[PDB]
Amino acid sequence: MGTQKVTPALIFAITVATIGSFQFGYNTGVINAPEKIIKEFITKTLTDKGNAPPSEVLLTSLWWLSVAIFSVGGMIGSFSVGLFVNRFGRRNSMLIVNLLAVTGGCFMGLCKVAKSVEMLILGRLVIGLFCGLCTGFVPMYIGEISPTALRGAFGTLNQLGIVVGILVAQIFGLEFILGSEELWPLLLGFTILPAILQSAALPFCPESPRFLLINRKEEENAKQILQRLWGTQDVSQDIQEMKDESARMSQEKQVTVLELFRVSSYRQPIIISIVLQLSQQLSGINAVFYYSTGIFKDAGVQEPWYATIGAGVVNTIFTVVSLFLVERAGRRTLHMIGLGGMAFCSTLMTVSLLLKDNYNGMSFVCIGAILVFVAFFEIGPGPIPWFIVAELFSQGPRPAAMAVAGCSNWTSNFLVGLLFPSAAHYLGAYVFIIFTGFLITFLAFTFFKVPETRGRTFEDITRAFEGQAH
Numbered sequence: 001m002g003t004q005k006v007t008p009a010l011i012f013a014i015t016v017a018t019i020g021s022f023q024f025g026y027n028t029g030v031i032n033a034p035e036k037i038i039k040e041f042i043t044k045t046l047t048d049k050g051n052a053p054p055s056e057v058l059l060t061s062l063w064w065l066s067v068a069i070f071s072v073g074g075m076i077g078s079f080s081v082g083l084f085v086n087r088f089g090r091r092n093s094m095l096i097v098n099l100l101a102v103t104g105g106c107f108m109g110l111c112k113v114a115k116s117v118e119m120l121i122l123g124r125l126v127i128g129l130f131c132g133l134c135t136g137f138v139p140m141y142i143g144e145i146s147p148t149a150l151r152g153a154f155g156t157l158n159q160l161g162i163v164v165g166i167l168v169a170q171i172f173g174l175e176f177i178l179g180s181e182e183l184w185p186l187l188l189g190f191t192i193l194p195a196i197l198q199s200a201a202l203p204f205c206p207e208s209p210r211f212l213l214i215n216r217k218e219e220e221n222a223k224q225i226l227q228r229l230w231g232t233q234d235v236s237q238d239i240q241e242m243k244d245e246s247a248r249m250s251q252e253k254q255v256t257v258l259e260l261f262r263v264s265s266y267r268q269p270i271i272i273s274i275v276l277q278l279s280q281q282l283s284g285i286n287a288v289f290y291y292s293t294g295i296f297k298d299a300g301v302q303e304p305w306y307a308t309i310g311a312g313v314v315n316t317i318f319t320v321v322s323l324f325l326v327e328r329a330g331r332r333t334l335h336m337i338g339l340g341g342m343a344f345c346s347t348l349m350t351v352s353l354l355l356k357d358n359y360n361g362m363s364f365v366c367i368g369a370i371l372v373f374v375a376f377f378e379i380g381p382g383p384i385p386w387f388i389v390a391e392l393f394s395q396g397p398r399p400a401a402m403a404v405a406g407c408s409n410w411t412s413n414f415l416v417g418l419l420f421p422s423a424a425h426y427l428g429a430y431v432f433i434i435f436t437g438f439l440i441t442f443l444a445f446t447f448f449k450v451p452e453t454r455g456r457t458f459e460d461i462t463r464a465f466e467g468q469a470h
């Protein structure tokens, strides 16, 4: 660490940033529990306005839209971060977009008294736009303000917020809390509250000193912010690394999305970045989490909702585990262990499901395979892809790279949700071998293609990619 310290100022800045991480997880998970309540609302709204009750095809379509419009907004929002972070800075970008969070949350809080299914859909679209921007803003901000030796650990706090957000959404979704016919608008409108908290706290967070020095050429301002955030007057190594990056950025054209696919020096890290996002989403994690309740039920769990909250607890615990390991073990090891362990668990889900009606006891194996699958996911493929893109690029290309990577994350998220019900319909229990195939494929890619970034400066990582490109 040299003289660099973890100050209360640093903890404060990063915690406040990860409120957007909490928003992404909360809004990802909140919609699942009140599904029947919300379909009832859709039917009652369509009839109360005169129309004939929806068929189940129509109800399913409108519910699918209510869920999926979120991912569409996330695809658009994540791809749009480059429009914000260089124009307003990283800190102010997070501040401004909470207008989206409050607006989207109000559309969802008010759709029932407005008797407006459109307002529900618009809300989920707006909150997806917000969350898409967040999933880009937060790791960029944390990656740019963390000490190098702790960039991975601090990067994992983003995923910690996501999984804490999911767990809170599951808990609030319990019917004796907010997941009731009366209170489900509050379950969705809750997202306004973190946003108000974060917006109150963000002015007191520092701008990224890398943004200030490199993008804005304010060396003295950056240096002062670094000295306070890290609790030391000696920041010469880091300042000089930033001046190196500033010199490099000055000598290369402004980076565009398309250019990331033309320049050889950028093509390797952007392929890595995109592939690592796929390895997260094409693990099937959101298919496994969402369908876990029905799988638990078919395995005999008498109260399957508490087993899914158990999965959410496991999801949180092993994010903390990854947090305390990623600087020791490094990115490669944790990510590969997660992919490999998930490969085993998804395969075991297929095997247990195929045998459980014949072999007494395999039901307990289905239950364990789901829970262990989630633990392995959070060892690496959960947290690492969200923060790794920030450390794979230097200052100039990072916003356009994270726009692309994040969009690929949301798009593959969408594609799993789009295609999984059909594949499960044809393949039954074999559907999880599809995720096994991706997991194994991406484990091979990781072992052969993903450099170790732990404890390395951005300049050192970028130089290695340029050396390879030569």
Ligand SMILES: CCCCCCCC/C=C/CCCCCCCC(=O)OC[C@H](O)CO
Pocket (backbone or CB within 6 Å): 014, 015, 016, 018, 019, 022, 157, 158, 160, 161, 162, 164, 165, 193, 194, 196, 197, 200
């Ligand atoms: C000033 C007026 C504000 C209005 C008052 C309403 C505030 C109530 C909000 C409660 C939930 C907030 C949850 C915020 C999310 C916590 C972030 C997190 O989970 O941390 C991630 C990781 O641990 C790295 O810190």
Ligand SMILES: CCCCCCCC/C=C\CCCCCCCC(=O)OC[C@H](O)CO
Pocket (backbone or CB within 6 Å): 028, 029, 030, 032, 033, 034, 035, 036, 067, 166, 170, 285, 286, 287, 289, 290, 291, 292, 293, 294, 304, 305, 308, 417
């Ligand atoms: C739980 C009561 C059962 C009755 C209602 C059945 C639906 C709930 C099923 C799983 C909840 C999982 C919540 C945790 C969040 C999972 C993460 C996720 O990806 O959500 C799925 C996707 O957003 C949208 O399909």
Ligand SMILES: CCCCCCCC/C=C\CCCCCCCC(=O)OC[C@H](O)CO
Pocket (backbone or CB within 6 Å): 060, 063, 064, 065, 067, 068, 071, 286, 287, 290, 291, 413, 414, 415, 416, 417, 418, 419, 420, 421
């Ligand atoms: C007839 C289809 C079922 C009715 C609607 C329920 C499905 C969720 C709706 C859109 C998925 C949006 C894509 C992003 C969602 C995350 C991936 C996911 O959750 O996959 C599981 C999903 O429930 C399915 O496979």
Ligand SMILES: OC[C@H]1O[C@H](O)[C@H](O)[C@@H](O)[C@@H]1O
Pocket (backbone or CB within 6 Å): 028, 159, 162, 163, 166, 280, 285, 286, 315, 381, 382, 383, 386, 413
């Ligand atoms: O905890 C798992 C959640 O976080 C992951 O990093 C993904 O961003 C999200 O799709 C998933 O539902």
